[PDB]
Amino acid sequence: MRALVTGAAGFIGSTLVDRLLADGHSVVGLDNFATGRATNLEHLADNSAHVFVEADIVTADLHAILEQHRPEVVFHLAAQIDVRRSVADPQFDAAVNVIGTVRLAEAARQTGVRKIVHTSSGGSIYGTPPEYPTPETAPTDPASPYAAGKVAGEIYLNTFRHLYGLDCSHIAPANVYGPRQDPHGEAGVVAIFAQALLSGKPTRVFGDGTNTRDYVFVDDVVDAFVRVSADVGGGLRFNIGTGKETSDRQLHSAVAAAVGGPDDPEFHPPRLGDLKRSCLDIGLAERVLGWRPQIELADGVRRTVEYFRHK
Amino acid sequence: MRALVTGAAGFIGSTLVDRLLADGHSVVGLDNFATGRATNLEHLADNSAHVFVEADIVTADLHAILEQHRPEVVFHLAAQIDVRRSVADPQFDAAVNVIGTVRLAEAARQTGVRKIVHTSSGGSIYGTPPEYPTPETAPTDPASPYAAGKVAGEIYLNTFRHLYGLDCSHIAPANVYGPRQDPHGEAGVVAIFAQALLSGKPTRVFGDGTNTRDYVFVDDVVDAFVRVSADVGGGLRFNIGTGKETSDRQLHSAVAAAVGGPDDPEFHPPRLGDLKRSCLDIGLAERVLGWRPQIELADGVRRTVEYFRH
Ligand SMILES: NC(=O)c1ccc[n+]([C@@H]2O[C@H](COP(=O)([O-])OP(=O)(O)OC[C@H]3O[C@@H](n4cnc5c(N)ncnc54)[C@H](O)[C@@H]3O)[C@@H](O)[C@H]2O)c1
Numbered sequence: 093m094r095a096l097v098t099g100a101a102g103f104i105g106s107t108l109v110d111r112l113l114a115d116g117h118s119v120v121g122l123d124n125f126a127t128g129r130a131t132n133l134e135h136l137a138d139n140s141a142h143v144f145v146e147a148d149i150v151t152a153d154l155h156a157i158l159e160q161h162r163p164e165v166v167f168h169l170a171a172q173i174d175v176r177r178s179v180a181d182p183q184f185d186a187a188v189n190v191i192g193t194v195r196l197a198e199a200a201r202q203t204g205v206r207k208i209v210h211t212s213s214g215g216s217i218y219g220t221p222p223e224y225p226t227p228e229t230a231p232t233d234p235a236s237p238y239a240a241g242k243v244a245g246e247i248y249l250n251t252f253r254h255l256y257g258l259d260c261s262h263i264a265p266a267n268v269y270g271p272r273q274d275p276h277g278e279a280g281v282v283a284i285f286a287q288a289l290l291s292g293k294p295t296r297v298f299g300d301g302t303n304t305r306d307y308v309f310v311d312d313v314v315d316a317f318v319r320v321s322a323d324v325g326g327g328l329r330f331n332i333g334t335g336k337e338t339s340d341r342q343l344h345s346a347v348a349a350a351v352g353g354p355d356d357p358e359f360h361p362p363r364l365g366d367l368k369r370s371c372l373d374i375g376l377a378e379r380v381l382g383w384r385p386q387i388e389l390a391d392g393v394r395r396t397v398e399y400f401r402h403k
Numbered sequence: 404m405r406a407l408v409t410g411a412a413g414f415i416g417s418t419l420v421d422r423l424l425a426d427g428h429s430v431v432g433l434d435n436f437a438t439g440r441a442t443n444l445e446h447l448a449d450n451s452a453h454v455f456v457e458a459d460i461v462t463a464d465l466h467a468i469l470e471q472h473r474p475e476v477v478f479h480l481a482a483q484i485d486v487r488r489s490v491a492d493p494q495f496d497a498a499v500n501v502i503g504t505v506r507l508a509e510a511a512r513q514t515g516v517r518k519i520v521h522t523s524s525g526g527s528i529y530g531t532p533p534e535y536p537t538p539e540t541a542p543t544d545p546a547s548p549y550a551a552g553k554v555a556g557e558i559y560l561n562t563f564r565h566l567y568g569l570d571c572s573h574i575a576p577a578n579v580y581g582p583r584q585d586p587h588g589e590a591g592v593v594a595i596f597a598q599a600l601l602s603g604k605p606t607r608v609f610g611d612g613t614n615t616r617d618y619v620f621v622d623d624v625v626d627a628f629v630r631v632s633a634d635v636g637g638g639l640r641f642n643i644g645t646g647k648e649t650s651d652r653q654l655h656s657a658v659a660a661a662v663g664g665p666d667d668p669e670f671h672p673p674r675l676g677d678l679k680r681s682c683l684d685i686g687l688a689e690r691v692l693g694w695r696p697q698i699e700l701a702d703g704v705r706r707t708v709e710y711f712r713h
Pocket residue numbers: 098099100101102103104105122123124125126127128129147148149150168169170171172173188192211212213214215264265266267268269274
């Protein structure tokens with residue numbers, strides 16, 4: 093297939109580019125380096141099956157770009173990803189995550205694209221549901237601008253599906269970790285902990301440290317993107333996670349053991365916008381896509397911590 | 404109360420301003436005249452309780468405006484309102500209806516505003532629903548960018564409620580009609596029919612004329628806004644309509660009968676983005692708010708026709 097990946101210079105995006113190329117596809121990458129890194133794509137410099145376009149999804153001529161490259165599937169990973177930043181500047185977050193998605197959809201419906209695979213946020217969109225693990229049937233109840241924008245993006249794509257028959261599916265990951273996650277980023281606890289503990293710098297945990305997330309390895313998430321890119325799951329969201337809960341304190345201990353030093357984090361006040369509990373029911377992904385996560389947290393952290401020691 | 408009305412120079416907005424003033428409130432009206440008209444507010448030139456601010460919700464310093472006027476309730480009616488326009492330019496529609504709403508909420512949460520009363524689209528947000536009349540419990544399923552942006556606005560305000568305790572309710576009207584509706588465009592069928600038939604100018608229906616809408620009179624809609632402005636229905640949507648379906652053809656006949664003379668509309672191709680049926684269950688608004696529509700279509704059509712005559 094001809095594929096285009098927005099957010100291609102990022103953590104998940106660059107990993108997806110690699111997989112798509114390995115699968116024999118031609119891949120156009122698109123990014124504006126808001127949070128992405130040149131080093132994530134530097135290995136592809138001489139791969140003729142890959143072309144890179146520097147573009148801001150908010151302002152670029154996406155019509156022209158998509159007309160030029162004629163992708164069959166657009167994998168949409170470009171976003172403002174920081175929940176705290178979304179609270180600090182909700183307009184900016186909405187511009188990238190809602191307006192950017194709308195512009196992409198409008199471009200795609202005119203340029204013969206078959207399908208857009210959106211990236212939602214399984215970890216945040218449900219707020220505090222009564223069910224854990226949380227199924228896709230649970231109503232959305234976003235508690236941060238970031239989460240709201242992700243839901244809004246799903247809804248807009250569903251709208252374009254009705255209007256033009258432009259197919260869409262929403263990959264809604266839990267908390268994704270692994271090689272290439274920015275260690276210096278404001279988000280990405282697994283990367284943050286590793287970077288700090290390996291440097292021997294202070295680590296922090298928020299609240300009492302009982303807040304919980306569902307940790308899924310990047311390779312598993314990438315596989316879900318591939319599976320959903322076919323003619324399937326139209327207008328549907330798929331939770332992509334493990335369905336297992338790990339508290340902030342538990343995670344710190346799991347990374348501290350992997351480093352092999354002290355397990356003594358500081359305790360800081362709760363962060364406005366952050367949920368207390370997150371865990372995804374992944375049954376739908378199994379039934380419909382035949383997708384299951386292969387990597388358990390212990391194995392995953394092991395692959396991750398050893399990536400960071402080489403850097 | 405100190406009220407602020409976005410979209411105050413518009414059809415529903417100007418009507419709401421009048422009601423709030425009649426109820427003894429102070430009102431700040433805000434508009435950029437995208438589709439509104441100064442003539443809708445010109446009768447207030449010497450009204451000592453309304454002040455007008457010309458501002459674009461997408462680009463203006465809303466923080467500064469709210470800081471100066473310190474409204475307790477913001478009635479948010481400023482929006483791109485045309486469904487076909489939203490299809491032609493979804494980015495622009497999303498900028499006004501989503502980004503504009505987000506900017507307003509971000510300003511409001513910093514400036515001591517108690518509550519934002521949002522205007523959603525009861526008529527369109529459910530798309531093709533499971534049942535008619537449609538209750539608020541039906542899932543949203545927008546099939547035009549306009550409808551999608553209205554849903555997104557609701558969700559964003561709900562988020563600000565969680566974050567900051569900035570209260571919100573979503574007034575979700577069906578098809579609103581009455582005096583001051585602009586008759587010169589492609590939206591606002593009652594006004595379009597009324598002015599054209601009075602002038603002896605051509606009229607049209609789309610497709611086979613069987614599309615239905617739920618036609619609710621502007622004065623009734625305004626009443627719902629006032630009721631929901633209190634500490635009631637936080638985070639909730641209220642369908643505001645009649646729960647009765649009228650076809651395009653039937654409506655044309657009603658307006659033609661009121662005007663007198665021919666009932667012979669042209670037939671044009673169907674419009675992409677337009678739903679085939681719309682009808683709202685209004686039970687929630689009755690129980691919670693004590694709201695009921697008073698004006699039946701026949702009466703409403705007469706009042707509308709008379710506005711356009713004079
Ligand atoms: N990492 C997680 O735990 C997680 C979980 C669920 C959802 N997601 C979603 O996955 C996607 C990828 O996130 P990630 O973890 O790889 O983060 P990342 O920051 O590494 O990747 C995001 C990429 O988007 C690019 N981008 C941002 N704004 C852009 C714009 N206006 N125009 C063009 N490119 C732009 C950035 O430069 C970056 O390369 C995002 O949509 C994110 O919301 C991430």
